[PDB]
């Protein structure tokens, strides 16, 4: 809970000063981090989806939830209810630990990392970023890797706007370019 | 919301109890307090009531929002109902699960003699 | 020439059988309907085909009740 204790001990005060909030409850919070793997290659091979789930479990520390097609789509040859991905919702202690591991270990291991886009906010202070290769997480062993897979990471926050979301993330020294 | 979803969860049973003309034992639960009301079939007259906001019950309790306080309220409301001679009510869980504090209240009201 | 048309089904004799104020015996059908165009009120049952029938002797009463301004049928005791 290093980053949560840092949030409470420093980031709250910093944001209160920076935005002049009238109550401490008004400070943006990091609510949840969701990791998503869109596994379209599972349409023909189910071991692909199972291996994606194993990668996600290794990375996040949580057994993932297999997601299924909401509607049938000819364009991707998918019928309704077909499992085509996996996600994990990280909250609380697990979420702060993953935030720390991401920031301090995984992002530094991104090939040719020149800084995360600061425009990748959804308009309400929530940040999403892509990963192209799961090896950037040390939990994934390099010489056991079957297929190259990435994932999506979303950080949902209680920020009313993108500027407050970016300030909240920057307070953790998020690697914004 | 949370209250809206709970009212929605409560409506089916409440309309059934109204259609049956049952005398209703209504429970309300908050993080800090539990409440019980016995409401006449017309739904708009409260016959008896007990709650952890009344000092006569709050004074004997370590904390008003746990299962022991729920048990005390259930016993108190059943005792009052039997003083006014009711003895036949239907339990309305008000969209709360039948579990935990609500179940402790309902069981204590039963043990005190209320029939439901 | 001919027609692709020319078909229909038997009329189902739906509708109101006992109107407001009529005195009915328990079991009497008050309305035959498709779905709950009318809803069951006090002393009125709703059958599997949404037929509304008296569950008590008394007088039919049509009312509009509830937040959706829906029509209800009750039997009022004589």
């Amino acid at each position: 809970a290093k980053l949560h204790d840092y949030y409470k001990d420093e980031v709250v005060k910093k944001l209160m000063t920076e935005f002049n909030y009238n109550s401490v409850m008004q400070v943006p919070r990091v609510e949840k981090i969701t990791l998503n793997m869109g596994v379209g290659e599972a349409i023909a091979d189910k071991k692909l989806l199972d291996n994606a789930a194993a990668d996600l479990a290794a990375i996040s520390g949580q057994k993932p939830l297999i997601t299924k097609a909401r509607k049938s789509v000819a364009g991707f040859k998918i019928r309704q209810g077909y499992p085509i991905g996996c996600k994990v919702t990280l909250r609380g202690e697990r979420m702060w630990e993953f935030f720390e591991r991401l920031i301090t270990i995984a992002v530094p291991r991104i090939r040719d990392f020149r800084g995360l886009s600061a425009k990748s906010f959804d308009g309400r202070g929530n940040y999403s970023m892509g990963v192209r290769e799961q090896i950037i997480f040390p939990e994934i062993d390099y010489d056991k890797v079957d297929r190259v897979r990435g994932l999506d990471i979303t950080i949902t926050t209680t920020a009313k706007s993108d500027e407050e979301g970016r300030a909240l993330l920057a307070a953790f020294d998020f690697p914004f370019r | 919301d949370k209250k809206s979803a709970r009212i929605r969860r409560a409506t089916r049973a409440r309309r059934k109890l109204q259609e049956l003309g049952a005398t209703r034992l209504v429970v309300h639960r908050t993080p800090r307090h539990i409440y019980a009301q016995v409401i006449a079939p017309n739904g708009s007259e409260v016959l008896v009531a007990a709650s952890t906001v009344e000092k006569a019950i709050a004074e004997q309790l370590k904390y008003t929002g746990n299962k022991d306080a729920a048990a005390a309220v259930g016993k108190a409301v059943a005792e009052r109902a039997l003083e006014k001679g009711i003895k036949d009510v239907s339990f309305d869980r008000s969209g709360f699960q039948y579990h935990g504090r609500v179940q402790a209240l309902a069981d204590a009201a039963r043990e005190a003699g209320l029939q439901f | 020439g001919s027609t692709r048309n020319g078909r229909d089904s038997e009329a189902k004799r739906l509708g109101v059988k006992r109107f407001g104020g009529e005195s009915v015996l328990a079991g009497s059908i008050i309305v035959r309907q498709r779905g709950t165009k009318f809803h069951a009120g006090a002393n009125v049952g709703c059958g599997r085909d949404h037929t509304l029938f008296a569950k008590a002797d008394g007088k039919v009463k049509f009312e509009v009740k509830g937040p959706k301004n829906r029509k209800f049928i009750s039997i009022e005791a004589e």
Partner: protein
């Protein structure tokens, strides 16, 4: 958390070359030997035309 279905999640030590050590819970199982970390990566730290070269090569 549901029992008996999640990966093993226990603390390890991440040792970077620059001498940074972080104690992090992980599913990796063993200790880590990082080649880089947030405290030493060039982008994190801050460590990241023709007339000039024409004059340098053709000095008169």
């Amino acid at each position: 958390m549901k029992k008996d279905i999640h990966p093993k999640y226990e603390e390890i030590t991440a040792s970077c070359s620059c001498g940074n050590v972080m104690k992090i819970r992980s599913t990796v199982g063993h200790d880590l030997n990082l080649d880089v970390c947030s405290k030493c990566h060039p982008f994190f730290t801050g460590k990241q035309g023709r007339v000039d070269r024409f004059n340098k090569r053709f000095n008169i």
